[PDB]
Structure formats: C-alpha cells, structure tokens
Amino acid sequence: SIDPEKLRDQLLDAFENKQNELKSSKAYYDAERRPDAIGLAVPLDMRKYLAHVGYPRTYVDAIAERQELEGFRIPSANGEEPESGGENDPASELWDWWQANNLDIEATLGHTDALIYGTAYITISMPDPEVDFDVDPEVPLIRVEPPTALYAEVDPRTRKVLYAIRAIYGADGNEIVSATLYLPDTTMTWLRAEGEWEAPTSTPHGLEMVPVIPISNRTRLSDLYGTSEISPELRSVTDAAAQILMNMQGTANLMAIPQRLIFGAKPEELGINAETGQRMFDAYMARILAFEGGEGAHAEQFSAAELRNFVDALDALDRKAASYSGLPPQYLSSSSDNPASAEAIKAAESRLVKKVERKNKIFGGAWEQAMRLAYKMVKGGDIPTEYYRMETVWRDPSTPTYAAKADAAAKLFANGAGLIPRERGWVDMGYTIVEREQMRQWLEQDQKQG
Amino acid sequence: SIDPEKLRDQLLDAFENKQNELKSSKAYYDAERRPDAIGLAVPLDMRKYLAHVGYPRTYVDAIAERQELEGFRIPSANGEEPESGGENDPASELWDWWQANNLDIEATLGHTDALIYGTAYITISMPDPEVDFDVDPEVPLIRVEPPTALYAEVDPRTRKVLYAIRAIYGADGNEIVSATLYLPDTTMTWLRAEGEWEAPTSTPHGLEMVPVIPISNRTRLSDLYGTSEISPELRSVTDAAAQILMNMQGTANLMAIPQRLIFGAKPEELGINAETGQRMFDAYMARILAFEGGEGAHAEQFSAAELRNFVDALDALDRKAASYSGLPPQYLSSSSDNPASAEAIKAAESRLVKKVERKNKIFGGAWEQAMRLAYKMVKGGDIPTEYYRMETVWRDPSTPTYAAKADAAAKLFANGAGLIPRERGWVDMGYTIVEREQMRQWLEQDQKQG
C-alpha cells in the first residue's frame, strides 16, 4: 500500500519545486525581463527603458498555427474497409468525443504549451452529472492541462505514469486552493487551501492505470521527460538582439547628432550668466554668431555615431535567427524577394513544414493513447485489438494552393478514364475526412439526375 | 562461460566508461557551454554572455526529418504476392507489428540518436502480461533504446553482438534503478536497484543470437562500430562561428560608438567635483559647450569599430557550413537565391537528398535484420528463406512537387492507351504501400458502376 496523505504532500513538493525550472522558459515567450537582455552601454538611470525581442514568440506560434487533426483512421476489423460505414464505425466514435469536448480548440492550446514548457498532460475522466452541466453525460470528459497546473511522475523502467497531481491556484496566484491526486485505481480531491484541508471527495476507476497521458515535445530517445522547443540556440540570439537594440536605442538618445564645442573664448566675454553657467540663443536660420575670439579661440565638434553601424549587426543577427529557428526568411523580413511561382513557396516553406509534420507524428502518439484510455473507461473490459494500430490523421501543414492542386487532380482523374479513383482525388485536393463523409452524400444527390 | 551476476558488473563498467565519450557529440546537438566556443577578445566579466551556434542541430535534424519507412518487400516463386490486407502477403504481417508497436514514432526519434551518437539499439522481446498493459499480447515487443541506456559488445571476427546490457538510471539520473542483460539464449533483469534490491527475473528465448540489433551510422566499412554524424568539420566551423559572434557582441557592448576626449583644460577648470571626477553636462540637443581651454586645448575621439568588419567574416563561415554539410544554401543564408521552379528545387535539394537516401540504405539493414529476428522469436520455427531477400521501402526524401508529377504521370498513362500500367503510375506519384490497398478498393467500387 501507499498512504494518500503522505503522497499528496510528496507530489505537491515535486510539482511546486519543478515550477522554478520552467519559469526560465516562459520568460522568452511572454518577453519578461531577463537580466542578460540588458544592453551594457546604456547609462544606469536609462536601463529601465528595455527593448524586448520576439523570435521565441514567432517560432512557437509558427508551429502551433499549423497543427490540427482531420480525424482518426483505424484498421479494418474484417472485410475490405470501415470507411463508407459512417456513424457506426470506430473512427467516427472517437471523432464524436473529440468534437463534443471541443478538443479542436483546446488541443491547439495544449500543443502550444507542450512547445513552450516541453510537456502538457491529457486527463481522461467520466463527467460528474452534479457539476459543469454544459456537457453530454454520455461522453468521457477529456481535459488538457499545462505543467503549471498538473504534474506526473513517469516510472523510467517502464514509461508509464506512477501517480500524478493536479493543483489549482486562487485568482491572484498566491495560494493553492484545491489539489487532486490520481492513482492507478482511484482519483481523490481536497477542496480548500493547504492550511485549511478537508476530507477528500474520492472515486474508484476501473482502468488499472493512471488516467493521465503526458503530451511531451522530444527530439531524441534521450529526451526522456521532454524538452522546451525554445532551444538555448534560439535564446542566445533573442538576448543578443535585445542587447543590440538597447545600445542602439541609447545611442539614438545620446550620440546620433554632433556635439558642438568652442574653445579659447572666455565665459565672461560670451556673457554667460555666472550663477547658471548658460546663455540663451535665438538660433533661427541664417543668424551668424560673431565672437570676440582671441587667444587661438575656435569651434570644433565631436561627430555623430552612425546608427548604421548597429543596424549592420541586426541584419546579420536576423540572418542567424532565421537559420537557427528554420522559419522561412520572409517571416523575419530578411528575404531579397517574395516568392514568384507556385512551387517557389514550397521551397521556402520546406524547412518548416517537415518540422511541423514531426510534431504531428510525436503528438499523434499521445492522442492515440488518450483515445484507448477513453474507450476503456466508457466501455470497460479489453479494447478491440484493432485500436492498438490506429493512426491520427492531420491537416497537410503547408499553405493551401488550391489553384495549382486543381489542374493536377483533374489531369489525373480525367472524368473517370484517368489514373486514380475519385476518392483518392478527394484526398489529394486535401478535403478532410469529416468533409468527404458529407461530400459523398452530395455526390449521390447529383448522380440521382446525372 | 561466465556466471551472469559477474558478467553484469563487467558490462556496467564498460557502459559507464562509454558515457564520457558520447557526451562529446551531445554538446553540439544541445548548444552546451564549450570552452573552445568562447570568443577571446571580450573581457573576463563579459565571458558569461555565451553565443550559441545552430549548425550541428540544423544538420542532424535536416537529415532525420526526411526519413520514413513505408513498408517491406519480400519476393516469392509465385512472381507476385497479392496485396491482400493485413497478413496474407508476409510483408503485411511485418507492417502489422510495425504499427502494434508505434515504430512509426520510435524510429523517427531513434534515427536522431543514431545520427548524434553514431548508434542506437533495436530490442526484441515477447510482451510481459503482468507489466505490458498497453500492447496486443500476441505481437512481439520491438523497441528502440539509445546508447545512453544500452551497450552491446560486438565481436570483431563476426560483427555479432556477444552480449548486451540495458541500464536505466533513476529520475535524478544517479543510481541504476534496473539492469537487463541479454545473453544468446536468455533475457535476465534485476528490478529495483543494481540487483541489490531484487533477485533477477529470467526468460529463455528460441534464438542463436542476442535479441538486440545495432542501428549504426557507418560512413565506410572502416567505421567498424559506427560514428557520430556531427563531423569534425561541422564542429570546427560551429566553434569558429561561436567565437566571431561573441567578439562582435562584445564590440557592440563597448565600442560600436566613438569615445570622446578633450586635452588642455585641468579638471578644476571644468568645475569637475573632486570626489567623483565628473560634472553633469546639460545633455539636451543643440547646446554648445564653451570652455576657456587655457593650455591651448583641443578635442579628439577614438573611432567606433566597424561592425561590418566582423559581419563579412561571418558570411564566409556560413558559406563554409553550407558546403561541408551539403544543406541547400537556403537553409543557412537568407542572401542565397530562392529557387523559382521545380527543376531548380531538384537542383538545390540534390546534395542533401542523396545523403538521406544513404541513411535509408544503411539503417534499412538494421530494421530488416530486426524483423527476421522477430519472426524467429514469435513463430519458433526456422525463417522461410525468402526473408533473406527482403528489403525496406522508404519515403522519397525530396519535396513533393505534385503539380509537376501529375502532368508527367497523366502523360505516361494516357487513359490506359499510354506507356505505363496503372500500378506504376501510382508508385511514380509516391503513394505508400498502405495507401495502395485503399486505391484497390476505391477502384473496384468505381468500376462497379463504370
């Protein structure tokens, strides 16, 4: 056995400790003040006029913009296909829960925070009909949580979760107001703040494994607990650009114009006010200042600093931030030109869209578990062994180019005489599974007249 | 022969020793602090503001990003095997195991560790019904382990593995919380810590060989044990660029602007405060500073450093990194021309695409041998000798220039009157073996009408 009370505190420790690491990563996407960003040449009273830099915001958005599911695809149990079987099939069951939970919205936020902090967690839980009444009580509730609110310990010998804690703060963020512990056979919640606990609301569940799945961003088998997408490579150029921008901004307040000197001419002879050390000048156009001079008196000036000198460094540093992140060059305004042909886009895009496709591959492994868990909760017993072989189906991450896809697809289909069957032409034009299932009805309504 | 409880310690020493070698390559894929990266000109207090350089990670991703297995090929004396769903062609049984294990996910990670460190290990076992909750219990558990978690002694006479150990560190990375030792005929594991906290579980297996296969990055036969993809030339240009980028950043913090000077007026003649060596100049625009300059004074300034003088050295290092890695110039320089046409994209990708196809050729032999070994472990009998002729099939590494491929495939098929049979048109479009069976069904369901 393990004591739930000791375990509640043990996991509150590991969680509330681990928040200190991930605070460093958030500071790049929220553009919080980092000490290292602050440009050293700026005078000390002026150091408060910070320059913030947006490469990490741009990069995590440019990926999370491009991820969505078209649906789920599951092996044929027996016979040729499930595909024309419609609302009775197992693929449309899993898509029904996805729509009913609005995971089409909040999975996009879960993907985003998995790229910020390196992990997010999917919780599966049948709804309690006594709370949160905006739900279908026939459908398992699925909730995605950030690592700022859910924490889970993976056993490294397997890769399963051992136990996990979800804890939620008061509106000012100063105090935990409720905590929930998930265990392999039960879930428990304590309903008030840590100095003021009360006996837990507790439920069994039949899954015999913890009903939480870690979505984790990873690049290697070696990244065993996931990794922030905002790499140290990209942090360094984010902070370097801030140091340049502050030093250039200070220069524009202090040196972008010449400083004018006069030597040899005595302050009393200039008539300078002896108490204040200064004299007024009208200085409108074509006034000539006539001086008594003598003693070798003359005027000379310190030059301006060229702000171009700093700009040459920023142009070079953008060319670094592009190549490190793998964004297209137009995203960082640095290209010699726009694209000018249908595939000249695909060239510039190709470095990003292959990355987005691997994020789809790696998060597919989370959702294809989340739906096995949700099935086993709703139905009980063994999962139909086809489900171990499902694949999630994702939007093609590149920009849509419908007019260039069109004259290709029609040349392959050739009014039914052609190389490909009709429905592969629909897949090729990029129509989503959920859309082809309505479009096959419209085809029958048309073929009714011919 | 050796007593296994003696052999595990002998292996754990060799495994512990190995970590310090492979940690060298790790420090380029993560941009860790490398002492050779630190630019020498910046003073000893500014040395903390490390630059990091992204070429090695850009390269090792840009290879692994392109790789994907699409299925298996097995010949027979029948001249063809019918496509026939999930088992009747033996290649479809192998692909069924390739999805019941998520090897479509774990391979695209595993190749990244196999490029970084130079090796990764494919492990085969029958699943444990007491522990493996989330697998079909009748398929073989085939899984990839990085060289940070598995070590195998390979005999130089034969290139067979003699024995291998898989050792898992705890959540803090310190203690070895379990070890699994694979012998030619037996698998053994100690489950709580170093065999200190448990006696070993064991299982015999029906093989002559240790059930572990090395994926190895071999450039030439003389890489007898495989080698890191982060080549000495890429390490060289990476560290060279890191020094020049730091010296430029330090220049912008100290010397991107003139330093102004006056001579011929003692501090007392300026009204400088004696305790602090300064006076508060009235810094606003268009003042004129008046001095007595009583020695016969003059004004001078040291020049700013030209930051362009670092920048057009960094140009040459990016152009070196392009030539050494063979990445398309557009991966590293925004000033290189974006290719305007599909032919120009085949030109620019060619240097990379060929090298990806080498990694496909060389890693294919590892997966191919892993499947033959899985077949003996599941079915117990000798392998049908056709499996020795089996080969892998992989994604076309090049970007999908669909509108150019469609007009070409349409011209060759010419509505059945043309050169090619229908099936060759489907492979020339790059449709997977998995999609080809959907093509079969959707064509029959169209030819049912005509």
Next chain:
Amino acid sequence: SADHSQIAQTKDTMFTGYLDPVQAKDYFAEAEKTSIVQRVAQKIPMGATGIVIPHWTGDVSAQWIGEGDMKPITKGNMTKRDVHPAKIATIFVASAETVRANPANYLGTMRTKVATAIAMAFDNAALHGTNAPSAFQGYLDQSNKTQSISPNAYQGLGVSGLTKLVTDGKKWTHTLLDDTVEPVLNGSVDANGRPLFVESTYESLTTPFREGRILGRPTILSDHVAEGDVVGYAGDFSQIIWGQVGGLSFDVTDQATLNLGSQESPNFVSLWQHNLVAVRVEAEYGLLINDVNAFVKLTFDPVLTTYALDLDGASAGNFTLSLDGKTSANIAYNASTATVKSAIVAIDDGVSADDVTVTGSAGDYTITVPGTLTADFSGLTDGEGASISVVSVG
C-alpha cells in the same frame, strides 16, 4: 586557481601533451582488484536501520524417571545481536575545462578507481581491521589460532591447521590464499622429491591454483590477502555475513561549497566561484562475524602470537590462563609481569623462559607466546568486563 593544485584536477602537468595524435593505449595496465569478502561471505539483505539476529540459548533437558516419580519442570532461553551498516565516502573535483575535454579518459578512469578503492577499503576493514568502522562486529585477524605452512602445505593445512579447528569443535569450509604462496604449494614434496599437488609430467597448474579443492574444501585465490606474516585463512566462512544498503551512489554538482581544510581549520571554496565540477560517491556496508576464533591464520613460517589482557579495574580475586590445551596454577588479579610470566612457564608445556615475554602493570598485561592463549575469570570477584584479545602481529 593555480595549476598543480593537490585537490583540483585543472588542465595540469599530469595531462602533458594529451591533445597530440600519437599518445598510445596503456600497454602496461593492471586488472582492478575485487573483494574476497564479497565472493566468500553470504550476502544478507538489510536496510539503513540495520537488522537484529535472534539466537537460541536454552539448554532444555529431560530426566530419566521411575514409576510414579513426578516429572521435572524446564524452560528455554533466547538472545539477539544487533547489526548496523557503516558508511564510506569520497569526493573528487575537476576544473570545468578538464571535465569538458576529459583528457586521458580521466573521469571514466577515476569512477573505476574510486570504485576499486571503496571495495578494497571494505575488504581490508573485514580482514585486518585497518581503519574499520565502529559498526563492524569484529574482523578476521582477531583469531587466536595460527599455523605455519612453508615446510609442507598438505601437513600445514590438512593435519596441523585442521587439528586447531576441530579441537575447538569448528568446521573447515574454505581456504583463502594470497597468490604469493604459489612457491609453497609448488615444492611441498614427498620424500622422493615429487610435489604433492601436480601431475606426473608437471605441465599444468597445481590444482589449488585452478581454484580446485584442498582435500574436501574449495579454495579462493587473490593478490591482496597477505599482511605481515599472515598469508591466508582457513575456516568456516558460513560464520561471516555482510550486506550493502544501495549501489555506489555517484552524483555531480557545481554550485556547492567545499572545505579543503578540517572543520576547525576550514578553507572554503565555492565550486561555482572558480568554475569547478565535483563528483561525490558513497556506499553503506554491514558486516558481522559470529566467532572470530573460528578461523585459523595461515602464516608462512613459525611465529609468536601476541595478546592484550584487560582486568576491567577488578578490585579482587584470582584468574587462570590456558595455553593450547594446558592450564596454569591460580593467578592473583594484581600479579607482577615477572609473576604472570612464571605462571605461564608453570603450565606444563614446551614453552621456556627465553620464549615467553610480558609487559604491563596491575592490568593491561601485554603478552607474546608461541600458541593459542585464553583466560578463565571464574575466581575474579569484580570487573566482569575483564577480557583478552589478539592485539597486533609482532
């Protein structure tokens, strides 16, 4: 800090030229040591809080009885021993630039070298008591039994050595031999000059050196068993038990502070302040020997055995001493060194006034004698902690 620190491994003179392409593999390396104790003693499981071992001690009895003669009453009795694990530890420290480069494979080497050092410290503490921690319940050298072996190994082991064990009712189960003893297992001839322990044509190792059996008993060879005149051990290694609480627990830090002095004379350094990296290593071991007199110390040629006798401040009575099988006349609790020497030669034994030697006063009597010495305190009327032990060789 300066190069060639005695503490910090910092790109030092020791690594001279490591960067060059011509530095070879070491061709003159040696095998790392492995503990004999961990091969021969049974490994009992234990946690950090240690264990208690129960032992029976009731001399339970029954009596021959007549018709209607009423039956006698008896009861059993029991005791227990505590065992606790000791802890052994070290830290080794390198400059960040050292650990980034790992010249001469220093860290990978050093991890094995501290592992051998921990193992050898445990072995030495179990055999010889050198630096043994207070938690270890005795050590193998404390045995009051010794035996010469060089003249003929079979006679030394199987006859004389065994006699000293079975006369005290102990079994014989193994021999531990230092591999320096090979020239004595060679030779050991019959009267015709053939060696006892090898084949007619002398092709192959004398069978004990094959890890064979001397008579019935397995033998364990090692290259680090001998200290002083003691060259090996014979006995029942079932009487010794040990345990380990966890693995060699290597971890690494670089933010910590270390002290290079003592706590009373400290010399603190932050590892971050000068950019070091440090690896800390620790382990815990328990060790119990049920009876240290159950073993016989094999020794190369005839030698005296030396003892310390403590009277625990006893204020009155008489004791007695026994050497091998023989027993002295009664001895007063406060007798002089010349007095107790005279009581030893009066034992009726082959010992003589030129062999026996003594030093002490009213207590703490050190004595050296060519045999197994032991004491009877039955007539001592005070100081029940009074005791005798082997103290050192020489």
